[PDB]
Design a protein around this ligand. Structure first.
Ligand SMILES: Cc1cc2nc3c(=O)[nH]c(=O)nc-3n(C[C@H](O)[C@H](O)[C@H](O)COP(=O)(O)OP(=O)(O)OC[C@H]3O[C@@H](n4cnc5c(N)ncnc54)[C@H](O)[C@@H]3O)c2cc1C
Ligand SMILES: Cc1cc2nc3c(=O)[nH]c(=O)nc-3n(C[C@H](O)[C@H](O)[C@H](O)COP(=O)(O)OP(=O)(O)OC[C@H]3O[C@@H](n4cnc5c(N)ncnc54)[C@H](O)[C@@H]3O)c2cc1C
Ligand SMILES: Cc1ccc2c(=O)c(C(=O)O)c[nH]c2n1
Ligand SMILES: Cc1ccc2c(=O)c(C(=O)O)c[nH]c2n1
Ligand SMILES: [Cl-]
Ligand SMILES: [Cl-]
Ligand SMILES: [K+]
Ligand SMILES: [K+]
Ligand code: NA
Ligand code: NA
Lengths: 593, 593
């Protein structure tokens, strides 16, 4: 494997130094490169099992087996005397910048994965360009650099969730002795949006400064891959040019879908519009049942809004259905209405949005239930959350040879490579992968290290933990109970479970036996934890550290031997004893023995 | 080991059935015992490696090698035909109740460890008594069943911490768009105390009902161990009697210390008095620097109080000192004053506590700094938090032979056994063990299983995670950085670290580069995580799941291969890259690449 690894490494690296930690010739070259501000990867062969073997293999490229060896874009450029000769003769800049292509890397898409890949690549002396363009929504909404999460996803949705959580905090503060009257306090949408948008603007700016400080070229331009090494760019002036790159990372993400019904595009909005909406949504219908649908419905209700969710079938398809039902039950018991087994037929406009007074319009939504009854109700705002899709026909010419799946996602190897060998795809467009920001970031950073620094480490997409930021949050890592049973059979599955009550809920007079957790375990594999699930406050904080234990193959016994931190919600994972098979109730009292 | 285990098991178990899961004779006995409401342990030999060997060993006690075999208090009572003979002849009640002693177990102390041990023992048919008495504080404060944590510890302190956290929640809610004016809202101490005390009363009651429902005898009586099997009890009427028990668990905990200075006992208070204080503490001096001192100072300041902490030397001795300094810096920057390098000499009374209007008194505290300057300041309340101590001379007669250490704590084996072989000690009085509620609970429950159900599992006291519930919380698991360096040497330690900023702090305009985390790792052991440390909100929820990974031997690579949950504070543990040895700043901007 050594010679194949060295061939791949040398071919792809922009600027790389084969070195040893203790070699003074290696230091003289490093000091020259640092003095010349020449960024590069370094492989210290004295720190590798197969270092002796890599030294021998290097003579296939350079005819030498000594360190240091410096390579540029697939070519041996010199030992220490040669690199110091180019430096002293003012030749070294020209040599380290020599390329068949404008860039070593072009990243098409300036979101979670693309920015992480481009910044990481630049660290190893890849000459990098990041392209980002935000096609406006149908009402004309656009935003700055950073992608879906930063501008219209995780960041603003979690901030608006925090605004919603602070309602319950106002309520609780009265029971804890604070002299405020919750009933007299109102929420101002636009004040909140201004604060969220100021934060997002600081991120848009921060990314532009980070790219400038890493010597990455940022182009606010729509990129189209027209051949393996050619990207056509279209700038704001509609000026069309071609730039060339050695490696191409496709990181273009997805955008909301609309249903094909009259008035949906004209009169509804999506999450892309919600997070900067200049008017308060008012009485709101959310059509959909994804995590986006429920998160948005939930914070809007907690802000004091009249909210209905129109559900075609089930909530949170693909997540553990027991947990999904508990998530929705909590919502229904806390001010969210559900129109169940219901689909929309038409959106009719009753009032146009008021762009001066910043007031919503008014819409008539017609739909129907599975039982044949009509749905007909007025809403000020209608939010579609009915899926997301890539729009790669925009992004790649069909003649380039990048294989897509039946959903228009990119078919990749376990190292993110497409069917075009210099072209990789990361993030939400990579078929089959969890569509999450930290997944796109790890994939992009690890890929950049493989391309430009001879790393071997792949991204592990297994047992990737999630959290749904509904009013009562839901954290999970691993299999749903139903998927565990389908895979291993019911007789090989043991489920430990318990209700719990946050201590913070006691004096606040909140619910007993609503927060809930379970461990789905495999009996024949030492009670291996296949899936962890928790409904409760701060569920992402609870779940994250257990992800490390599950990656390590935690068993039930590993959870039991660990001592709780008291008083916490998370400690309940360390004392679970009630099995589903026993039929014993998972309910709990305050204190027992 | 089998014959030694079987000898110990048979001698100690109150009522035990040796069984196999598939034996219909075993079922007939189980159904009779369940019908007669006779509780017992069961060992299913078909579920043990050495089951075949245990069957053979059983003939040393019973002369038979078949199942079922039923034992009572060290004696073989019968096979299936014999047990059904006693039942049919109304003899079985008398036989299963036959004992040399009043109880199989007497627990002296009805706190975290004792209640957990007694309830667990009762499950296996141990006839159990729990003794609890609360000696009043010097001002006369007392409370109900449940121990330090429930009444004057973790439970009320965390509830008053939540009351304090809700101040910052009121502040934040304005930036998130809520129309309240933080400056107009005040806190009412006594309203809060009423709520906390109502919760505590529900726990006191819950424990009494749980003991009644497990057929445990609860005596509100002071117990004194006068010989290995004899406990002298003194009831509220000062009636003195003796009860006898086979096994004795000492679970009597600790109480606050006072310094030997004039006025301390007469005019100061401790945490024992604070949690039910009927008057608002007002301007408060906390003398001490333990976690109790800082937690209490912190919530009192967040409630709007004028608070000073008098520190003799350092904060949080025994915890990582870098983290301790950050904890205190946050406090000092958020309304806690520190009188550093300062000790008290005298407390003078200026006003008596007002018991009708529920107002504090007034005190003059005289002390001195190491620099020779005098301290002289008025306070309404003075809280001593200057350690806790066991008071076992009260609890055990010196003639019984239970060895204590130089601090008056019980010297125990790794299975909680004292120098008196039937007498065990759990919780805060067990020398050398972390003084934590979940430690006392695991120790007590696991011990009861070893005594009464033939369990072998010991409590693991290593890498027990903690959280200090200061205004900015501090969670830890494993070694401090300084202890890791002392043990392994500086050259074998790598520390990864980062600041972070909760997303919830962005729109709220709270601090950059104050929350902080680090992993202290051992270079020569695959970068094993020796210690994890986090300063930030919800730090107990963050830290708990990583405790499971650390118990499993997590390395840095295990943290890196795990994918973050976004947006959370905890995810920062999955991307740490900056080492202390590098000298690179741990500060972070919002968004970089
Ligand atoms: C409402 C919502 C909430 C979410 N909440 C969370 C959450 O809490 N946690 C979580 O982990 N994930 C969350 N996600 C998912 C997360 O946003 C995505 O997984 C992540 O943004 C995907 O990153 P990416 O790099 O694949 O694409 P994106 O971040 O979508 O970035 C792609 C970028 O490329 C641009 N682009 C597209 N075509 C071109 C072109 N031809 N040329 C130039 N630029 C182009 C796009 O406009 C965009 O700026 C959420 C998503 C949504 C919609
Ligand atoms: C202010 C404070 C905050 C704390 N916060 C936390 C925290 O957040 N998390 C955590 O894990 N730990 C915390 N602790 C520690 C925790 O309270 C203890 O570790 C735990 O209560 C110890 O349990 P135990 O069973 O050893 O003793 P205890 O709970 O102290 O119970 C001993 C009981 O026995 C009684 N007793 C004593 N002598 C006799 C006698 N002769 N006969 C009869 N009864 C007797 C005592 O009065 C008491 O009721 C805190 C402690 C304090 C003081
Ligand atoms: C509940 C309900 C039902 C029908 C209508 C309607 O036709 C209409 C209009 O202006 O067309 C306005 N509002 C309506 N509201
Ligand atoms: C700051 C300060 C210093 C001294 C005294 C004092 O002697 C006193 C008294 O009544 O004795 C009351 N209050 C005081 N306050
Ligand atoms: Cl921008
Ligand atoms: Cl009581
Ligand atoms: K445990
Ligand atoms: K990671
Ligand atoms: Na265990
Ligand atoms: Na990794």
């Amino acid at each position: 494997g050594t010679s194949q690894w060295l061939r791949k490494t040398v071919d792809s690296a922009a600027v790389i130094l084969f070195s040893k930690t203790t070699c003074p010739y290696c230091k003289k070259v490093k000091d020259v490169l640092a003095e010349a501000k020449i960024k590069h990867a370094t492989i210290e062969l004295d720190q590798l099992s197969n270092g002796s073997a890599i030294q021998k293999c290097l003579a296939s490229f350079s005819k030498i087996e000594t360190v240091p060896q410096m390579f540029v874009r697939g070519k041996f450029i010199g030992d220490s005397q040669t690199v110091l000769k180019y430096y002293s003769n003012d030749e070294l800049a020209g040599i380290v910048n020599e390329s068949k292509y404008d860039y070593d890397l072009i990243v098409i898409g300036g979101g979670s994965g693309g920015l992480a890949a481009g910044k990481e690549a630049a660290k190893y002396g890849a000459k990098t360009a990041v392209l980002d363009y935000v096609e406006p929504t149908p009402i004309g909404t656009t935003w700055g650099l950073g992608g879906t999460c930063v501008n219209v996803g995780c960041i603003p949705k979690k901030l608006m969730h925090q605004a919603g959580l602070l309602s319950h905090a106002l309520e609780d503060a009265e029971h804890f002795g604070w002299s405020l009257d919750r009933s007299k306090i109102s929420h101002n949408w636009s004040t909140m949006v201004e604060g969220v948008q100021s934060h997002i603007g600081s991120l848009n700016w921060g990314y532009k400064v980070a790219l400038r400080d890493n010597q990455v070229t940022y182009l606010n331009a729509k990129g189209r891959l027209i051949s393996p090494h050619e990207v056509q760019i279209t700038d704001k002036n509609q000026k069309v040019s071609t730039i060339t790159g050695n490696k191409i990372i496709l990181a273009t993400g997805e955008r909301p879908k609309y249903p094909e019904i009259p008035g949906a595009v004209e009169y509804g909005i999506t999450s892309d519009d919600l997070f900067s909406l200049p008017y308060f949504p008012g009485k709101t219908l959310v059509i959909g049942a994804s995590y986006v649908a429920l998160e948005c419905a939930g914070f809007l209700a907690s802000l004091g809004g009249d909210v209905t969710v129109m559900v075609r079938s089930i909530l949170l398809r693909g997540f553990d259905q027991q947990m999904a039902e508990k998530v929705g039950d909590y919502m229904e018991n806390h001010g969210v209405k559900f129109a169940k087994l219901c689909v929309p037929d038409e959106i009719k406009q009753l009032k146009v949005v008021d762009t001066e007074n910043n007031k919503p319009g008014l819409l008539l939504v017609k739909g129907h239930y599975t039982d044949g009854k009509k749905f007909e109700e007025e809403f000020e705002t209608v939010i579609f959350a009915v899926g997301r899709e890539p729009q790669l026909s925009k992004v790649l010419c069909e003649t380039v040879g990048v294989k897509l799946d039946k959903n228009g996602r990119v078919v990749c190897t376990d190292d993110e490579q497409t069917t075009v060998s210099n072209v990789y795809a990361i993030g939400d467009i990579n078929a089959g992968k969890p569509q999450l920001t930290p997944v796109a970031i790890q994939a992009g950073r690890y890929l950049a290290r493989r391309l430009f620094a001879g790393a071997t480490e792949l991204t592990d997409y297994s047992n990737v933990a999630t959290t749904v930021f509904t009013p009562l949050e839901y954290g999970a890592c691993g299999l749903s109970e139903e998927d565990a049973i389908e895979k291993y059979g019911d007789k090989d599955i043991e489920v430990y479970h318990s209700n719990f009550k946050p201590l913070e809920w006691t004096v606040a007079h909140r619910e007993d036996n609503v927060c809930y957790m379970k461990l789905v375990c495999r009996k024949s594999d030492n009670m291996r934890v296949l899936g962890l699930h928790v409904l409760g406050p701060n569920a992402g904080e609870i779940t994250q550290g257990y992800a490390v234990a599950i990656k390590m193959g935690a068993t039930k016994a590993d959870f039991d031997r660990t001592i709780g931190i008291h008083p916490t919600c998370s400690e309940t994972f360390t004392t679970l004893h009630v099995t589903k098979k026993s039929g014993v109730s998972p309910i709990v009292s305050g204190c027992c023995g």
